[PDB]
Structures are given as structure tokens and as C-alpha cells.
Design a protein around this ligand. Structure first.
Ligand SMILES: [Zn+2]
Lengths: 105, 165, 228, 50, 43, 92, 146, 765
């Protein structure tokens, strides 16, 4: 039952991540972090695929779709602002989500 | 069906991200606990950031042991090692569109004490060839003194990157 | 069975592999004495019947709490009520640990108290904790395991693996008149000389009469005699 | 006692090969069948096996 | 490394003891392969 | 007992407090722990005789069993069982 | 041979998902291991039993194994009727890979013919993984005497 | 006749074996050697710098073998034949290019010969490479010779393939009494070092090493490995639940009572307890002496600049042994090919050559130091003419080493005996039979039956028949017909690509997970720890089979032990087979027909993703079929030619499966002792001892293997009639009976050729 268990999570994950994406929408400070491949060929953007699926993409005939992340629930995370070596230390506050994007065929 | 737009922001001083494995989830309404008082020390690359957090006298302080050995009574000390890996961005949602600001370097936070190394010494007390490990040590202890004042407020953090579109 | 067993004999070494001991009990029956002498002689049931082991610290007193469940001692036959494990608990105390105190209240609860490099009490109790569910309640300190097997046609008897011999022979409930034991050298330490010589020619003949051919009775007796 | 039947078959497959003027193939797990050799023999006036 | 000249030559109780030590001098001898015959009576 | 002290989060060891009190504190870090500590780790045969078992019982009827035990000269040990309660009993 | 297969297959499906009476041979999976060893044993000998019984008179191997010459009735039975249960070490063909004899067989191989068993004689030939099993016992017995 | 599915599968081997010859090993490795290794070794030291004189520096720009200017090669390089008759060695000159600088402020160049070097037969630099017919007749030598051997100083010897235990990998063994032990061995450049982990008592575990004197309380070592927080450690090596807590909690308890911190006593402990200091430039003395120690002597290859990588690795090394401490089994025995790797002579020659080059350096540096300490007339040259007569230390040194079989190393300091073997020429089989043979080294006793008996994993990767019955049994094996030995590719271009696939760096990961799925190991090193193994595996294998990184770098899942392994480390056997997609084969008829007729050859199927190589522990994960008829579409792969299981020497026996294994084993030993006609040049060749046959004939029954190896072209034996009967009585037990006048027209008529050599010398008189 290899493909079975995974597609069951892919369905769910492509939903749950959409909610917490729109659950934090307005002004209050909430942050998420991304992981993307290098060299950054060029942009296109994310959106719900037809029939409730989820598909990211870039422009100029390329399709890159990936979602989900490894297990959370430990990390207490906030990024800080550092500039010029002069004192800055600016806290934008907290963090929310984690997501990775794998390319595909 | 619809479209979710996303953007890629500019340089903007880049960023540095905190994480620490000490505090767990409180399972309550607000899970996170906010660290305070700042007081960080800094240096050039591979900077070994230092984190300082206050100590309360109200709950289980055990004063008799303090006066005996370490007089500290004061703000807790945490340090950590920074690391960098390419292809990592941060995201925040504004209105119906998505905006994205690159993170750059990352650091881990786990503590240690100068109430130790100083106490171990006072207890005990009474050239061309090198590279790698100790070169990151001998130079380390020498070159690090910086006083960073952490002040938290936000207005232009958006509009700076927003107008770049 | 084969040649390395003959090596064990010929060498006449002290120790040896799986030295089974044969013994007869009283008669042929399923209940009582069959399982009684079975549960009498071996190891420690302390770690079994112990139920739950509790470690409690209240105020100025240090408490080791072990409450025995009576259910196991009823089904598995061992002769005592409570105090005899308590004297077995103090045996353990007398051996590797301490002589201090022992307590008895109800449901076979036994309390252990300790008191005098700093904070040694915590480190003390920490070691005494893990070492507690070990020590022998009853039986000997020899047997690796025993077995109850069907003897001859319809009869019954047991075979035991250990160096015990005389002690399990002295053990009440079994007739020790007719018995047998391996590793002849130790048989020399009890019966001695002749009886040992009669045993060593008995085993040599046996194991070599199975695999094949014949060595004849004459040549064997002379081999055991020149040694003894 | 040595228990090898592979040699005893070799004679039939060998004899049949000479009569047809062809080198007869053989291999592990497969190869030329023994049965067809019998009919190649018996039609020329030889007993079917050996 | 070892130059040992004395207690050694007295040793070698194993390996080649069968061949070298007791098998060196035996005179008036011979060796050859085997082959059957019905016609020779036993002995 | 495997405990830990929040913040530093290393370990908690029992230390003897002065004059009657037993406490515990984290090593190299200031702390004090009040509370109670705890840990836990894990029939045809019949005979006539008086029944010693008493609730309302006072039973007349009983069961018995016979086997020879111990030495040959050593007498017979009998095993009694009661009808009502079903209690096993043993005496020589 | 086929009637001795599905019977063990019926016993092996009760292994993990079912309960059965176990001999005092200690723990589980040894229980049916002694049963599969006993069942296939008798079946082997039984097949070879009727073989030699109905074999024609004046034949060489029978008469030769009959008197003084060479071998025994057990030997000629393996040539003609069937062989079975190649066993070294005192047990059945310990797994080289993880929980499987050969990659040619499904994971968790408890099946007859999947371990140390051959239903083919020396005359009919050997199935490809009927060979390596025989090579084992041959290698084991050879290095033994050496 | 129409093309069927059964017929073409047999036609695949001749297409495969025609491209790559029967012996790949010696050839392919020596070709890779003289190009890649030669240019890399000279790049290690390109300079020699000595102290005296205002300035001196010398640089080697390029090193080549017997090639420069307009000359394609040496004018005439002595052929194999003539080289064998005159007792001379077989060698080609080594061309070097150096840049000399004096105090006359000059920069110039030249082309010099530092010395000779042996060249193996059938190599790119030989004269026999790509030659046909009359070329051999003119050169006086046989076209059918196997090749791949070194001829030096009269007769010829062969470097034998040597098996080696797994290098730079964790192996865990369990023992009665004392406890469980895991061993770790590796080599970085100059030195080889071995780490031994041990648990003596109490469940508290120790670290043994030749560097550190006494066994350290690892819980303290891990503190010196950069981690402080304690319970994070417990949540790492133990993690979530069950019984894994209390066992490691014992060591955790008493380690932190007397001495606890991640900095102060962590290092200072180790350094005060540490063994001999090597006496020179020693005083860095501080917590930093352990720093360079916690990097270099830190027991493995990981190192680099941080403490985080190494820490978790040692922790994960502690993770497995505490699992097998709980209950028996759950371990890795060292027996089967999966944990074993063989190394071809290509690397051995490089090790021996670089040592003699290093020895020359210091002597050459000191050579100029003579005049350097001399008062006047600084010298431009004699670093040319004097080192030329000072040279040949490499010549004789390498020639004596290859002739003797005793290799002296000053670097690893490993003296190995019984490497090179003289090729025995009796029949045509014995020459081809001795080659493609796996030897072995050490592993102790003759008494242990563990590394003796055959194992099921050996199937298809080795010969299950051939074996030298005698004192040594099972210690030497042979390769099958279709096999491939793995080379080494590269490291860096995997990780970065793996990161693209969605795995993440271990540094950013909060290090307390035994919880999420598997993790990706690179050569035994934990890196990514990624979720979703399915899409990870499949897509990675797709990038392999199709457009990139063919052959090795294979990925396999681990069900119980939780991880996914990717191994790029070569020096291992590979076997070909066919992929079955969905319910049917990827081959499909008309393709293989396009092959046999006019074109398409081999290695093209790898480009189309038809046939490929399984390997390592990945062969365990896959599923292989037997026949095309047998397919049940749960299958990952089928097999091409199942009869390739037997070796090349064992392919002589007709109907092998009908017999029993002990009978086939004896023939493999006796079959090479048969007397053939050997080669064509045989009459023009003078050997030391040789047996000949008068009227040779092919076997009446042939085999599919004997045609591919070219046997029947040079058969050994006499085809004769026979009868099975009891006759004579001189027959009886194991004795035959011949017939006169059959023998008087001749039967098996032999010839015996020996030789004698004498030398007329000249004394000092
Ligand atoms: Zn604390």
C-alpha cells in the first residue's frame, strides 16, 4: 500500500495548506517560509487546480508543482533584520507555516 | 479557476532567522512564549549570536545557592551557530495576493554559561602552522565584541518592498 | 552428541556445555509434586510476581515500594506467605547492598529506607532501584532452566541443566537413590573414584553406540581404568 | 552412488547427432530434447534408447 | 627478524614432523600408482 | 526518575536540604522543586469435614485429593476443596 | 505433491492471522516449521515408495542396490521419482537477503518450493531456483569432510 | 522463420559480449589508470621546494606515456613474443615536462624521461590494440590469446583480483557475554585508521581508539560534539516511546553527575587523557588541542568545520546498537556480497607507483642540496643528467615489486604478500580460467565455517559451481558470464540535485526526529531526512534510467530500519536484466529484430531505457522473474538468460542440471588440467613445461557457452566410442580398460616439451 497512503495525504495536505494560507490573510503579522530550487529560471504563481487540486507554476512553458512539509510542532521561529553591521535587530514577529516545492514532469 | 498572484521582493538588508529547541508548545490558546530584554553580541561572519533572557525572582529562585557560587541573579545566556543554504524564501499574505521575501542565513539557538568558564578558571587557578578548526577559534575569541540594541516596531517593512512592483 | 562431546570427556575439563542432570521424583502423576519440585529449585520469580515497582519520596523519608500480587504465588506453587521473601529481601540486602531496615504493612508491600560525593542518596537509590527486580526469592543459584518430560513408555520425570547435583538431590520431594549426572569430574567431587569411573565408561559407550559400528565393551573399560 | 544421469543421456544425444551429421546442442536448464532423439534413432533401425 | 639458532632446531614437533623428521631416512624403498588384477592370490 | 528543568532543560537530581527537608535542583542553574514525587514502571469425589471458610458458608460438604509427597516414610498430604466457595486447601 | 502444497498453504495463512496449538518446542514459527518438515518428509518418501515397488524386474540399479554393489533404495528413488527437503545446518535454507530466500520470490517467503524444496528428479531436470539450493547442500557436505 | 519473444533473448549475450570482452577487469582499469590516475597523481605534487639559495622552484606541467612530437609512438616497441624470448621486460618510457629556474632568473622547459614502466597486454598503449589477422602473423603471435597480463623478466605473471571488506561504512556485530560491537574503518589520503565502539558493562557504553588512551563516556564525547541540552540527546538516540529510554538513561545519569557541560570539561577531559603527542610543534595547548582532535581524530571521514554533522552521526551510530542491545537479531552479519566489495588492480598499481615517486622526491630535493651548500658557481643543470643516472629506482623498484609479490609501502605501511601469480599454461581453459577469479585476504581462521559455505545472495553475481577443492575451499570464487564491475563517478553533483527534489539541509532541521518517515543516506551519511519517499524514489530512478547518471548510483528503500539509501561508491559487481513496465516487457518484438539484422548494437537499450544494472542492496528490494511466460504483473524486472548463473569454466559440462553439485565441482578442477593444443603460435613458442595433443577433436555435444568463449576452435580431448558392460575384472573399482590396435593407430597421442637455459657471464677479472 505504497501509492495508497501517500495520495491520501496529498489530497488532505493540498487542502489544509490552502486554509492556513487564507486563514492568515489580513494585516496581523504571520509568516511562512519557502524552499525552492536554485538558478531561478524565469513569474508564474500558485493556485487551486480544477476539481479541488493544487498546482503551482512558472511562466514560459514550465510546470512546477509541490506542496507539504516535514513535521512541525517544535520550532519557535522569527526572522530578524540586520543591516550594515550597525544596530538594527528588527523583529517582524512569530512564524506560521512551512512548505517545499518539488519540480515534476 | 481563479488566480493567486505571487511576487519576489528585493534585497532589503536581507534577513536572519531565529530558532530554538528549548521551549515546547504550551497547548493553550496562545502556544508561543515571547523572549525579552535582547542584549545580543555580534561579530563578522560565523558570528555566533548571543541571546539574553531575564530571570524571575518570584518562582523557585533558590537564593542560598546563588550567593555561594555564582552571583548572577540575572538575565539568562544563550548562544548559537549560524549557517547558510541557498534557495530559501519567506512568505506573507496581503489581500488576495502573495508576497515573498528571501531569508538568506539561518541560525540555531542553544545555551551555555560564562558563569562556567570563568568559574572553572578561578577554581583551577588558585605559530605559523594552523588552519581550519582552531583558526575559527583563535580568531573568534579575539574579534567578537558588539553591542546590539534590539528595538521592535514596524511600518515601512511592507511599503518598501511593495512599491518595487 | 558427536566427537566434540568425546573431547569434553577425554579432556576431563572442569566446565562443559549444557550439562543435563537426570532425577526421579516419587511416582508417575500429573499434578502436585510434578509441578511442585519444578517451581521449587530454579532462579528468581521476584521480577515476575513483583507486580508494579514504585519509587516514592515524601518529606524526610526515602521509600522503595514493591507490592506483590498474590495471584501468581497461588497458581505457581512456591512455599511461603510473605515474610520468607522479606527474609529473602534482607538476604539481598546482606549480600550486595546494605543492612538498614525493612517494613511490612499490607498486600506484601516492602519499604526500604536509606540515609548517610554530595547528594549521594539520589545516586545511591538510583543504583539500588534497578538492582532490586533481580535477586533470588527461592531455588538455587545454578539452574539455567528445567524441563518436565515423559519418561519411558507412559511414565514421567524431569531433566535439569546445572552444576547443582547434591543440593537438588538433597532437595526434598524427590528420591535421590537412583540418579545420573554428566561432566564426570564433578561426580568425582561427590561420589568419587569408582562411581565416577563407572560413569565415564557409561557415557563413552553410550554416545559411541549411536552413530555407528561397535567399539566392543573390552577396550572401553581399560581406557577409563588407566585414568581413574 | 555417484548419482549422475547427465552422462547417460549424452550418449543418445551424441549418437543421434552423428547419424544426422550435425553437432548436437545441449545446455543447463534447457536444450535439445531427449524424446526427439528416440524417433531419430528408431527409424534408422536402432533401439530407441541406447 | 628472529635469528634463533638453538632451542628452535630442537623444536618443530608439528607440521613437517610427519614428513621431514621421521620420514627423511628410510632406505631400500619405492613408490608407484595402483592397478587391479584377479589373477594374483591374496598375500 | 528522569525529570527536567524548563529553560536550561538538562536534568533534576535530588539534593539534601539543610535540617530535615529533602529537595532537588538543576545542576549549574538556580531552581527549586516543591511537590510529591512519583514514578511507576511495570467433580465426583466428596468427603465429610468441617469447612474453616466462614462468611455465611459453614459448609458440610468438601472435596479431597491424594498424593504421596516428600520422603517414603513421610506421611500423606491431603488437599481439600469446598463446594460453595471453591477454595483450595492444603494440609498434611 | 500438489495435495501436499495447499495444505501447508492453509497452515501458513493461519500463521500470522490465526491461532493454533503449539508443541512444547518453545516459541512460534518453529511450530509449523516442524510441521512443514514432517509433512513434506512423508510425502517425499511416499512418492518414492510406490515408484520402486512397481519398477520392472532385471533392471540394473534395483539389482545393484539390492545386493552388495553400490548405494541404497533411497539413492535410486531420487534418480527416478522425486527428491525433497535439502537441509543444511539442521534447518531450512536461512535467508541470504531480507526475509527472503531469493529475489525471484515474494517478500516474507514461507511457501513450500520457495525454500529448500524440489519436486523434480535428476531425470526430469531442475527448475532454475531448484539448483542453488542443491548447490548449498553440496558445498556444505563437501567442505565438511575436507 | 518469424521473430519470437523466446529466440531473441538468447541473441542478447553475443551482442553484449562482442563489445566488452570476456575479461573487462584488467583492461578497463589499466586504461583508466594511465590517463585519469596519472594526471591526478602528478597534480598532487607538481612542485619541489628546497631551502638554500635566494630562490629555487621547479614545476612539472605534464606527464605522458611514450608520446610526443610527431611520433605516434616509439619507433619499434618490442612485441610480446620477442620480449619473452630475450628475457627482457615489457615496458614503455615515461615522458615528463618540467620547468627549471635558476638564480640567473630564467624560465624554460624540456622533455625528459624519468624512467620506464610495465605495460599490460591488450591495452590502448600496446601494439596489439585493434589488430587483425596478418598483423599478428607478422608479429608472430596468437590472435585468440586472452591478454590482460604483465610480462616481465623472462616468464609472465598475473595480478589477481583481490576482495576487500566494506570501506568507510558502519558494520554492527553482536556477541555472547560482554555485548554488542560495531566497527568503523576508513582512509583519508596518507593514513588509514580504525574506530571501535564497545559496551563493557551496565549498558553504559564506551569508545575505544588507538588515539585516546582510555575508553571515554560517550555522553561526555557528545557534549564535546557540540550539543549541550541533554534531553535533546535522549530524544535523538532514543526518541519517542517503548523501552529505549531506561537503557541509555543509565549512562546519561552518571555521566552528568560528576562532570557535565558541553564545553569546559568536555574537551579538557579528552586532551589530558590523550596518548603520545608526536613531539614536534606540539604546543597549541589549550581546549584547542581537542579541537584539532575533535576534527581529525574524531573517528570518521565527516569532519569539515562544524560540530553538528559529526555529532548526529555518532548519535545515529549509537542509535542502532542500543536497538540490538534490547533484543537479539536486528543486526548486520558480515558474510554476503552485499557488504563486500572487490577492487581491481587499477588502484593497486597507483598505490605502488605513487610511493616510489615520493621516495624519489626527497632524494632529488637533497640531490641539489649538495652543490647548494657548496660555496660557488650556482648550477643551472645536472638536475637533468645526474637525476637520469640517479633514476631507474622506479624501474627496478616496480619491476622487483611486481615480480616478487611483496609490496613495501611507507605511507599506509601495508606489506602484502601473495598478490601476483604466474599464469599456468596447460590448456586453453587454464589461461582463461585463472583470470576472472576472485581471491581473498585474511579474515583469520581455517576453523571457522562461516565464510566458507555458499550463500543465496551469491546467485548470478558469481559462479556457484567452480571451486578449487583442497585445503582452501570457498575462499576463492569466480565471476559469471555477464557481470560488470563498478567504477567511481563523483560526489558533489548529487546533494544539490537531491535538494531540488525537495529534501532539506540537516542544519535547519530541528534535530529531534525519529518520527517522520525515512531519510536519505549518502554513502552512509544522513543528509536530507525527507518525507514522501514514493515520489522521491520513482522520479530519481527515472532521471537515472533515461537522461542522466546511468549504471551505478542506485536507490533502494529500507522498510524496518527507517531510511532511504543512495550509494555512489563503486568497486562492486553489476548484473544486466530487463525492465517490465505495467504488465508486459519493454522489449517488444520488432525492436530486437532491428538489432540482429543490420544495426543498433548494444548500450543503445540503456539510452532507450530497456536493459540496465541492478546492484548493492537494491537487488533485495526489486523483484525478478524467470521466464516471459511466468510474468504476473506485480513484477519490477525479468531476467534474460538464466543459464548464465554458472561460470565460464563450468560451461563445458553437458546437461549440468541433471547431475549433483559435487560432481560439477570436481570437473571444474580437472577440466583445466586437460591437455589441449593451446594457441596457434605454439610451435614457434618455447615454454618451460608443456603437454601437446596430436589429433584433437570437438565434443560431439556442444554448449551455448563454449562457442562464445571460442572453445571448440581449440578443443582438448579425444572423441571416442565406448561400451557400458562388466568385462575384464582388471576393471572393478574406478579403473578402465583400453583396446589395442585402436591405440596402435594411436589414441590421445601426446608430446612433452621442456627447456633448459644457460648463461655465459663475465667477472671483474
Ligand atoms: Zn534547570
Amino acid at each position: 500500500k505504497e501509492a495508497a497512503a501517500e495520495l491520501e495525504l496529498l489530497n488532505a495536505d493540498h487542502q489544509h495548506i490552502l486554509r492556513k494560507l487564507k486563514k492568515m490573510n489580513n494585516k496581523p503579522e504571520r509568516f511562512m517560509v519557502f524552499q525552492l530550487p536554485t538558478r531561478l529560471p524565469a513569474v508564474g504563481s500558485i493556485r487551486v487546480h480544477k476539481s479541488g487540486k493544487l498546482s503551482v507554476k512558472i511562466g514560459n512553458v514550465v510546470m512546477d508543482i509541490g506542496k507539504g512539509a516535514e513535521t512541525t510542532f517544535l520550532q519557535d521561529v522569527i526572522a530578524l533584520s540586520i543591516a550594515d553591521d550597525a544596530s538594527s535587530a528588527e523583529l517582524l514577529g512569530r512564524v506560521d507555516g512551512k512548505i517545499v516545492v518539488t519540480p515534476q514532469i | 479557476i481563479e488566480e493567486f498572484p505571487l511576487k519576489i521582493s528585493g534585497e532589503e538588508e536581507s534577513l536572519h532567522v531565529f530558532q530554538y529547541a528549548n521551549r515546547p508548545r504550551l497547548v493553550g490558546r496562545k502556544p508561543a512564549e515571547h523572549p525579552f530584554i535582547s542584549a545580543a553580541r555580534y561579530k563578522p561572519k560565523s558570528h555566533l549570536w548571543e541571546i539574553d533572557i531575564p530571570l524571575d525572582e518570584q518562582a523557585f529562585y533558590n537564593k542560598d545557592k546563588a550567593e555561594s557560587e555564582w552571583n548572577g541573579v540575572n538575565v539568562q545566556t544563550l548562544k548559537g551557530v549560524g549557517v547558510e543554504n541557498n534557495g530559501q524564501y519567506a512568505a506573507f499574505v496581503k489581500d488576495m495576493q502573495v508576497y515573498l521575501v528571501p531569508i538568506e542565513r539561518v541560525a540555531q539557538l542553544k545555551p551555555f554559561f560564562k558563569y562556567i568558564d570563568d568559574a572553572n578558571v578561578t577554581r583551577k587557578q588558585e605559530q605559523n602552522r594552523l588552519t581550519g578548526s582552531l583558526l575559527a577559534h583563535k580568531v573568534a575569541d579575539e574579534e567578537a565584541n558588539i553591542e546590539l540594541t534590539w528595538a521592535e516596531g514596524t511600518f515601512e517593512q511592507f511599503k518598501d518592498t511593495i512599491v518595487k512592483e | 552428541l558427536g566427537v566434540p562431546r568425546i573431547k569434553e570427556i577425554i579432556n576431563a575439563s572442569k566446565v562443559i556445555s549444557t550439562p543435563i542432570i537426570n532425577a526421579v521424583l516419587v511416582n508417575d502423576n500429573d499434578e502436585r509434586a510434578a509441578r511442585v519440585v519444578k517451581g521449587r529449585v530454579e532462579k528468581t520469580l521476584l521480577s515476575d510476581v513483583a507486580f508494579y515497582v514504585q519509587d516514592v519520596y515524601k518529606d524526610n523519608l526515602s521509600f522503595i515500594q514493591v507490592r506483590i500480587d498474590l495471584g501468581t504465588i497461588d497458581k505457581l506453587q512456591l512455599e511461603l506467605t510473605i515474610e520468607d521473601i522479606a527474609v529473602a529481601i534482607t538476604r539481598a540486602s546482606k549480600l550486595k547492598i546494605q543492612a538498614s531496615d525493612v517494613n511490612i504493612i499490607g498486600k506484601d508491600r516492602i519499604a526500604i529506607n536509606v540515609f548517610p560525593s554530595e547528594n549521594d542518596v539520589f545516586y545511591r537509590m538510583q543504583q539500588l532501584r534497578r538492582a532490586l527486580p533481580d535477586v533470588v526469592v527461592k531455588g538455587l543459584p545454578d539452574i539455567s532452566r528445567a524441563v518436565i518430560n515423559i519418561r519411558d513408555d507412559g511414565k514421567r520425570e524431569l531433566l535439569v541443566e546445572g552444576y547443582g547435583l547434591r543440593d537438588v538431590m538433597c532437595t526434598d520431594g524427590v528420591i535421590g537413590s537412583r540418579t545420573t549426572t554428566n561432566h564426570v569430574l564433578e561426580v568425582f567431587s561427590v561420589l568419587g573414584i569408582e562411581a565416577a569411573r563407572y560413569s565415564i565408561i557409561r557415557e563413552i559407550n553410550y554416545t559411541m553406540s549411536n552413530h555407528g559400528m561397535s567399539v566392543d565393551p573390552r577396550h572401553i573399560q581399560l581406557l577409563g581404568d588407566v585414568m581413574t | 552412488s555417484r548419482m549422475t544421469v547427465g552422462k547417460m543421456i549424452e550418449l543418445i544425444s551424441g549418437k543421434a547427432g552423428v547419424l544426422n551429421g550435425t553437432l548436437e546442442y545441449g545446455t543447463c536448464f534447457g536444450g535439445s530434447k531427449l524424446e526427439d532423439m528416440s524417433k531419430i534413432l528408431v527409424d534408422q533401425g536402432f533401439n530407441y534408447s541406447g | 627478524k628472529p635469528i634463533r639458532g638453538f632451542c628452535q632446531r630442537l623444536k618443530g614437533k608439528q607440521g613437517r614432523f610427519r614428513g621431514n623428521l621421521s620420514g627423511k631416512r628410510v632406505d631400500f624403498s619405492g613408490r608407484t600408482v595402483i592397478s587391479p588384477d584377479p589373477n594374483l592370490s591374496i598375500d | 526518575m528522569l525529570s527536567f528543568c524548563p529553560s536550561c532543560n538538562n536534568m533534576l537530581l535530588i539534593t539534601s536540604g539543610d535540617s530535615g527537608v529533602y529537595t532537588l535542583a538543576c545542576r549549574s542553574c538556580p531552581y527549586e522543586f516543591p511537590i510529591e514525587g512519583i514514578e511507576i514502571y511495570d467433580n465426583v469425589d466428596q468427603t465429610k469435614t468441617q469447612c474453616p471458610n466462614y462468611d455465611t458458608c459453614g459448609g458440610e460438604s468438601a472435596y479431597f485429593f491424594q498424593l504421596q509427597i516428600r520422603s517414603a516414610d513421610e506421611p500423606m498430604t491431603t488437599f481439600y476443596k469446598c463446594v460453595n466457595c471453591g477454595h483450595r486447601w492444603k494440609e498434611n | 505433491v500438489e495435495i501436499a502444497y495447499h495444505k501447508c498453504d492453509e497452515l501458513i495463512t493461519l500463521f500470522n492471522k490465526g491461532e493454533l496449538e503449539t508443541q512444547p518446542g518453545c516459541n512460534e514459527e518453529q511450530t509449523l516449521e516442524a510441521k512443514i518438515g514432517g509433512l513434506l518428509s512423508k510425502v517425499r518418501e511416499e512418492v518414492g515408495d510406490v515408484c520402486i515397488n512397481e519398477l520392472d524386474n532385471w533392471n540394473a540399479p534395483l539389482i545393484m542396490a539390492t545386493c552388495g554393489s553400490k548405494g541404497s533404495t533411497l539413492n535410486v528413488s531420487q534418480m527416478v521419482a522425486v527428491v525433497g527437503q535439502q537441509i543444511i545446518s539442521g534447518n531450512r535454507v536461512p535467508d541470504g537477503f531480507q526475509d527472503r530466500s531469493l529475489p525471484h520470490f515474494p517478500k516474507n517467503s514461507k511457501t513450500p518450493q520457495s525454500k529448500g524444496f524440489v519436486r523434480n528428479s535428476f531425470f526430469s531436470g531442475l527448475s532454475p531456483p531448484e539448483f542453488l539450493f542443491h548447490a548449498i547442500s553440496g558445498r556444505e557436505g563437501l567442505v565438511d569432510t575436507a | 522463420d518469424e521473430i519470437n519473444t523466446a529466440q531473441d533473448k538468447w541473441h542478447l549475450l553475443p551482442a553484449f559480449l562482442k563489445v566488452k570482452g570476456l575479461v573487462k577487469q584488467h583492461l578497463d582499469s589499466f586504461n583508466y589508470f594511465v590517463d585519469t590516475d596519472l594526471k591526478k597523481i602528478i597534480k598532487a605534487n607538481q612542485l619541489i621546494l628546497s631551502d638554500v639559495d635566494p630562490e629555487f622552484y621547479l614545476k612539472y606541467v605534464d606527464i605522458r606515456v611514450g608520446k610526443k612530437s610527431s611520433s605516434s609512438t616509439k619507433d619499434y616497441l618490442t612485441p610480446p613474443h620477442e620480449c619473452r624470448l630475450r628475457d627482457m621486460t615489457y615496458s614503455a618510457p615515461i615522458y615528463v615536462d618540467i620547468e627549471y629556474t635558476r638564480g640567473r632568473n630564467i624560465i624554460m622547459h624540456k622533455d625528459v624521461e624519468i624512467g620506464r614502466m610495465p605495460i599490460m597486454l591488450r591495452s590502448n598503449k600496446c601494439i596489439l590494440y585493434d589488430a587483425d589477422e596478418s598483423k599478428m602473423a607478422k608479429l608472430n603471435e596468437c590472435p585468440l590469446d586472452p591478454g590482460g597480463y604483465f610480462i616481465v623478466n623472462g616468464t609472465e605473471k598475473v595480478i589477481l583480483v583481490q576482495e576487500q571488506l566494506s570501506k568507510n561504512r558502519i558494520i554492527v556485530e553482536a556477541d555472547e557475554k560482554k555485548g554488542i560491537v560495531q566497527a568503523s574503518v576508513t582512509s583519508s589520503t596518507h593514513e588509514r585508521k580504525s574506530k571501535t565502539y564497545v559496551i563493557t558493562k551496565n549498558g553504559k557504553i564506551y569508545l575505544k581508539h588507538n588515539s585516546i588512551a582510555e575508553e571515554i563516556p560517550i555522553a561526555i564525547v557528545l557534549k564535546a560534539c557540540g550539543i549541550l541540552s541533554d534531553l535533546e540527546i535522549m530524544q535523538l538516540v532514543c526518541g519517542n516511546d517503548s523501552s529505549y529510554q531506561d537503557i541509555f538513561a543509565v549512562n546519561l545519569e552518571e555521566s552528568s553527575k560528576l562532570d557535565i557541560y558541553t564545553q569546559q570539561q568536555a574537551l579538557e577531559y579528552i586532551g589530558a587523557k590523550v596518548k603520545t603527542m608526536r613531539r614536534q610543534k606540539l604546543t597549541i595547548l589549550q581546549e584547542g588541542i581537542e579541537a584539532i582532535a575533535t576534527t581529525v581524530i574524531a573517528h570518521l571521514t565527516v569532519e569539515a568545520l562544524d560540530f553538528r554533522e559529526k555529532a548526529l552521526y555518532i548519535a545515529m551510530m549509537t542509535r542502532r546498537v542500543v536497538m540490538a542491545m534490547y533484543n537479539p537479531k536486528m543486526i548486520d552479519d558480515r558474510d554476503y556480497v552485499g557488504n563486500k566489495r572487490l577492487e581491481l588492480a587499477g588502484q593497486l598499481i597507483s598505490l605502488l607507483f605513487e610511493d616510489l615517486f615520493k621516495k624519489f622526491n626527497n632524494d632529488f630535493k637533497l640531490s641539489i642540496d649538495k652543490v647548494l651548500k657548496k660555496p660557488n658557481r650556482a648550477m643551472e643543470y645536472d638536475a637533468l643528467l645526474s637525476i637520469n643516472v640517479h633514476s631507474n629506482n622506479i624501474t627496478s623498484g616496480l619491476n622487483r615489486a611486481i615480480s616478487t609479490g611483496n609490496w613495501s609501502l611507507k605511507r599506509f605501511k601495508m606489506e602484502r604478500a601473495g598478490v601476483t601469480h604466474v599464469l599456468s599454461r596447460l590448456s586453453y581453459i587454464s589461461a582463461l580460467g585463472m583470470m576472472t577469479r576472485i581471491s581473498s585476504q585474511f579474515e583469520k581462521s581455517r576453523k571457522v565455517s562461516g565464510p566458507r559455505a555458499l550463500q543465496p545472495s551469491q546467485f548470478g553475481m558469481l559462479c556457484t559451481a567452480d571451486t578449487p577443492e583442497g585445503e582452501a575451499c570457498g575462499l576463492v570464487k569466480n565471476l559469471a558470464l555477464m557481470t560488470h564491475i563498478t567504477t567511481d563517478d563523483e560526489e558533489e553533483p548529487i546533494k544539490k540535485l537531491c535538494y531540488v527534489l525537495g529534501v532539506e539541509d540537516i542544519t535547519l532541521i530541528d534535530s529531534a526526529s525519529l518520527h517522520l518517515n525515512y531519510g536519505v543516506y549518502l554513502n552512509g551519511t544522513l543528509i536530507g531526512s525527507i518525507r514522501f519517499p514514493t515520489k522521491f524514489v520513482t522520479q530519481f530512478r527515472h532521471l537515472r534510467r533515461t537522461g542522466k547518471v546511468s549504471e551505478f548510483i542506485s536507490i533502494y528503500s529500507n522498510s524496518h530500519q527507517m531510511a532511504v539509501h543512495i550509494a555512489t561508491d563503486g568497486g562492486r559487481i553489476c548484473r544486466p536484466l530487463i525492465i517490465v513496465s505495467d504488465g508486459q516487457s519493454r522489449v517488444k518484438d520488432i525492436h530486437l529484430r532491428k538489432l540482429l539484422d543490420g544495426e543498433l548494437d548494444f548500450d543503445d537499450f540503456l539510452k532507450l531505457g530497456l536493459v540496465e544494472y541492478l546492484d548493492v542492496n537494491e537487488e533485495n528490494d526489486s523483484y525478478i522473474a524467470l521466464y516471459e511466460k511466468d510474468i504476473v504483473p506485480s513484477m519490477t524486472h525479468l531476467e534474460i538468460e538464466p543459464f548464465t548463473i554458472l561460470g565460464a569454466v563450468a560451461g563445458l559440462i553437458p546437461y549440468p542440471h541433471h547431475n549433483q553439485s559435487p560432481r560439477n565441482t570436481y570437473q571444474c578442477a580437472m577440466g583445466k588440467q586437460a591437455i589441449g593444443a593451446i594457441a596457434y603460435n605454439q610451435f614457434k613458442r618455447i615454454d618451460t613445461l608443456l603437454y601437446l595433443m596430436t589429433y584433437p577433436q570437438q565434443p560431439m555435444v556442444k554448449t551455448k557457452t563454449i562457442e562464445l568463449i571460442d572453445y571448440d576452435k581449440l578443443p582438448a580431448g579425444q572423441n571416442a566410442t565406448v561400451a557400458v558392460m562388466s568385462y575384464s575384472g582388471y576393471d572393478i573399482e574406478d579403473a578402465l580398460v583400453l583396446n589395442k590396435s585402436s591405440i596402435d593407430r594411436g589414441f590421445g597421442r601426446c608430446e612433452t616439451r621442456r627447456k633448459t637455459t644457460t648463461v655465459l657471464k663475465r667477472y671483474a677479472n
